[PDB]
């Protein structure tokens, strides 16, 4: 049977036997996701071009505004909010929400695919929801994924129970449940990153990207991709196999990815589809960050791969 | 005045006085491109997955392509990346024009939500013979119109004719071409180069001293960023919006490259070079070449006329 | 705070305490409404003709196989249908749904406004389902309401708690809440029927017409308005107060519409809404079906005009 | 093979050898009708409702105006929304004048009514500079009309010298596709459409004409009735299924309540063009000449076999 993400969530939340806030909180995203796809798509640009005679922003706006109207949440982060949101005690929820709300944007105007990255934690605690509750490692998530604003558009939902994609149906406005518990490829075949920093890599990361252009083993040279927006590499990479890496360069000695709604996500997507994320010194889902706009390293992808990869960040310490 | 397609097409079509059939040509194209878009974007995807109790998208885009040109009585011969054979129009819905055209160019990759494209090239029919497959073997120094659809993060048509480059975005709440970037031109030198680093072993040595000088400038200057969607149009896009360069050299083991000349680098090269841009093969215009097989590739290296100039100095250097 | 049909649902059901059966049933439902509007504004028509190279029983299609999927229903009654469908084993649950997919399609072909309705029962033997979980008042509704297909499509969603309107925004695929608990004019000014057929008019029904044109005092005959399609017909009334009959008369005694999936849906909503509706010898609601799809008479709208009828009625009793 | 407004305009012109100005103009039209559409649709209804934290008709006309202005096909504009003609500034003129109803039906778009668009082309007749007496021709002096009905699904129906033509409208692709070719009306219907909340204000010829529907004299099937109350739609319904449309005068109305330029002759020479008739029961609509832009008129139209009922009956009464 044809399954909707409104149907597999409220599913997957009567199973757990749960009250409701995080389906309600998952339902309110998927609002979002639809209106900002509409948004990025160019819905009504002609009303802006005068027919009848600033996205990253209403992005926030969409997933802020879904997010508090949910009753679910209590802290919100924002790649576009200097501190997190303290959600009003009336709308106040459980779960607190680490989001990207158009990642990839600052390259938009070439029309290079964007999505949204959100990482979904509960708040334990009986204080009053401070900043500081967004604090935790990624171990800690209750839910994350992304939406993908390429060709198609696609919602990845990763849980406990595994990796889920949705494929939107603009047609109707319904998310479809298209790829069931997805697992990524043990091994794949192409590497994802800028290479134009080359000059500023680590031993280890230069050696490792001199393994995949010339094999060690007389396998054939992998291919290379960096769309240069992360959704799109990560869900490549997701969906192809490989691997993908910021590492730290001159410009962003802690990596240029933030850990709380870029990395931790896609660490979470990845290790639920079976892939890996490191650090090169930890798992990304282990960094306990200490400011929520924090940046981390990032090397991820599918299991063989990522220990390659570490197999010889091992060997140069 | 919101300009849109339609209306930009028929208003050049009013300033050259033309009768009309490279209008009809590209209206056609455009709900060609419009139902591309759609089906790309996965309308109606509920169905296939059960919602009530099937064409590849490379295939529906053909048929879709050839369909809505053989109906617009303005194409006598197409050549699509997906027929072995030009396909010869029926008299009558016989016109004076050839296209050819990647119906799906990135298609391939799909499965990930890349970017993908339609690339088209409008040629006229300069023989008096009865029309053949060689009326599509002209240089794309023939060229009457060419461009892309870019289905990305939004959908839009950029058109290629004499009078410049033009980028129409579609807005899906209307199925209208908008006009929102006019008499496009590309940066004389841009800070990104774009190719597969992957196959380096199998680099020209020019192709890798070219690539060493962006990544390790031997005069202070700071290193070009990298990009590489791996599907053409969206790089080539990039291309044209950011400035740079874009790389599908030849090699050792491809002495011709990889992309096709016809409906692939000739309409790239000719978008390229009406907005002030450069596009070689290493060793002449992408343009000059004479093509003798519709399916015949060539290799490309487009962008920036600065950046295309160096890799240029860096090839000579080599020979 | 923006509402929404699936978030207005679930916080009923939460606050129901629900296990949330009828809002999986609901949210199923929706699904199908969202996915008829976009065949009956024929999205896709284009391939039809040719650019590359039927509507009731999609409608019917799409509503059933929702159903089924939504782990809520056991028996399923559809206009479509001759028999009333019983819901495999797997997939049953506790409700029971009458609907007309698409409403008033006879005339799809000039455009007309056209609707789908549907009635909740929860099914009430433990009996292994039949026919007989459908045979039930529509006093014993849970839900019910009507998809209109209209210049915008809404839906009209009436449960204990009222009477509320979403929207369909189709640039999202959501029904955005935008009437709330909806009551109808005490007294209307519009009569609507088919007075074509005025020559088999129950004397009754002459009478009061008359007195709608040719009013007896000093007062504003009313208007005229007859779509010819119910749902259409309804909402006008619903919005507009007034009265809408398809009465009963000598040649059709017991009227020509459906009581299980037309007429007591929409007098639910009636009732609901604060509106009244009659066989003209008992309430609508108050019917105890034999035939799953046996005829009833139906006079709705504001209680005045339906009580002004009633009075005629009787005078010719 | 697959036709589109787009293409089927082009032709016609072409065809014509005219320069393009009328395909121009109708190109303008169709943008801004599915624009129309989409708003009418609902579309980003959601935004309004504060989903990230004007009326249909004022839009409607705001549309039509600058889509019309901006094709430069164009000098005077009467729209139902406007007291005044609008005459274009003098950069954008071109040869045409258009009447138009930008949302018909309108005023009960509260319960989800089909509504629709209404127009009427005329070529400018006057050399004189553009003004509103540029609007008021004669019907018969229509170059092309027609309307775009948003009902279940959005169709625009175009009438001009070749005949009459239906296009569905294509959402998913922003598409109007022809649908039916060279529309003809049955030359009798079943249906008459009329609102008969006003009977006690009908003159005798409309009520013994209405009362033929219901008890015919040759003792026949009696006719249904339907009335939506939207000009559009009971009209479309009366050149698909046949039959007869009437809004005649009544005390609130005493020049019927329907405006002549933009209402009246296009839909009157929409059912000409499809070969039904379209009267104010004194004379052809066409036939009207206007002395006022949003002047009123009486109206009976459709099927032929129909209206010369109608009139037969008109001409026993007087
Ligand atoms: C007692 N509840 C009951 O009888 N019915 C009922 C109905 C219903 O929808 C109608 C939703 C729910 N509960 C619900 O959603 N809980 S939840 O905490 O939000 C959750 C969602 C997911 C997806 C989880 C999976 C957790 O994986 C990490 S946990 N319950
Ligand atoms: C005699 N024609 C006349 O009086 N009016 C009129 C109206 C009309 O639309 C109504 C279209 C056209 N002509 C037309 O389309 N010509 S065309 O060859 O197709 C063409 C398209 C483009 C874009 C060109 C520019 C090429 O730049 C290098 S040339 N003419
Ligand atoms: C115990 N539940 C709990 O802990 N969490 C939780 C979450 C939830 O959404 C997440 C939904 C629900 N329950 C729910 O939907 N129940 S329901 O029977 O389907 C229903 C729908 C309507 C609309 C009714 C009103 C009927 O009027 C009488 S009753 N429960
Ligand atoms: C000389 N023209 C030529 O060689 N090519 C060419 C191309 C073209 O578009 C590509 C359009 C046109 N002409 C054109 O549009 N004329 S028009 O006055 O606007 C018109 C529209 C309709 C529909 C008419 C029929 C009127 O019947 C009532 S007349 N011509």
Redesign the interface.
Same mark, same amino acid.
């Given at each position: 049977? #044809?399954?909707?993400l409104?149907?597999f969530v409220?599913?997957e939340?009567?199973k757990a036997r749960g009250?409701?806030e995080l389906?309600?909180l998952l339902?309110?995203l998927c609002?979002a996701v639809?209106?900002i796809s509409?948004a990025?798509?160019?819905?009504?640009?002609?009303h802006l071009?005068?027919?009848?005679?600033k996205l990253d922003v209403?992005s926030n706006?969409?997933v802020?505004?879904?997010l508090?109207?949910?009753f679910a949440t209590c802290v919100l982060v924002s790649e576009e909010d200097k501190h997190a949101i303290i959600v009003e005690p009336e709308?106040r929820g459980k779960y607190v929400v680490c989001f990207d709300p158009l990642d990839?944007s600052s390259?938009?105007?070439?029309? #290079?695919?964007?999505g949204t990255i959100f990482g979904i934690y509960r708040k334990k605690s009986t204080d009053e929801p401070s900043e500081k509750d967004a604090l935790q490692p990624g171990r800690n998530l209750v839910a994350a994924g992304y939406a993908?604003?390429?060709?198609?558009?696609?919602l990845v939902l990763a849980m406990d129970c595994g990796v889920n994609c949705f494929?939107?149906?603009?047609?109707?406005?319904?998310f479809?449940?298209?790829d069931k518990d997805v697992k990524i490829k043990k091994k794949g075949k192409?590497?994802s990153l800028?290479?134009?920093?080359?000059?500023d890599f680590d031993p280890a990361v230069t050696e490792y990207i001199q393994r995949?252009?010339?094999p060690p083993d007389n396998s054939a040279?992998?291919?290379?991709?960096?769309?240069?927006s992360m959704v799109?590499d990560v869900?490549?990479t997701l #969906?192809?196999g490989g691997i993908f890496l910021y590492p730290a360069n001159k410009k962003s000695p802690n990596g240029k990815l933030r850990l709380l709604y870029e990395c931790n996500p896609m660490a979470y997507v990845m290790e639920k589809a079976g892939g890996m994320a490191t650090t090169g010194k930890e798992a990304v889902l282990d960094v306990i960050p200490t400011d929520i706009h924090q940046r981390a390293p990032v090397i991820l992808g599918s299991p063989d791969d990522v220990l390659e990869f570490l197999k010889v960040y091992e060997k140069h310490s």
């Open positions: 049977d #044809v399954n909707t409104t149907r409220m599913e939340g009567r009250t409701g389906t309600q339902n309110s609002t639809k209106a509409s990025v798509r160019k819905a009504g640009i002609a071009y005068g027919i009848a005679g209403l706006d969409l802020m505004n879904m508090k109207s949910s709308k990839g390259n938009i105007d070439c029309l #290079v695919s964007v993908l604003y390429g060709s198609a558009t696609m494929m939107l149906d603009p047609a109707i406005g319904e479809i449940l298209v192409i590497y800028n290479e134009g920093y080359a000059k995949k252009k010339f040279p992998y291919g290379a991709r960096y769309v240069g799109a869900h490549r #969906v192809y």
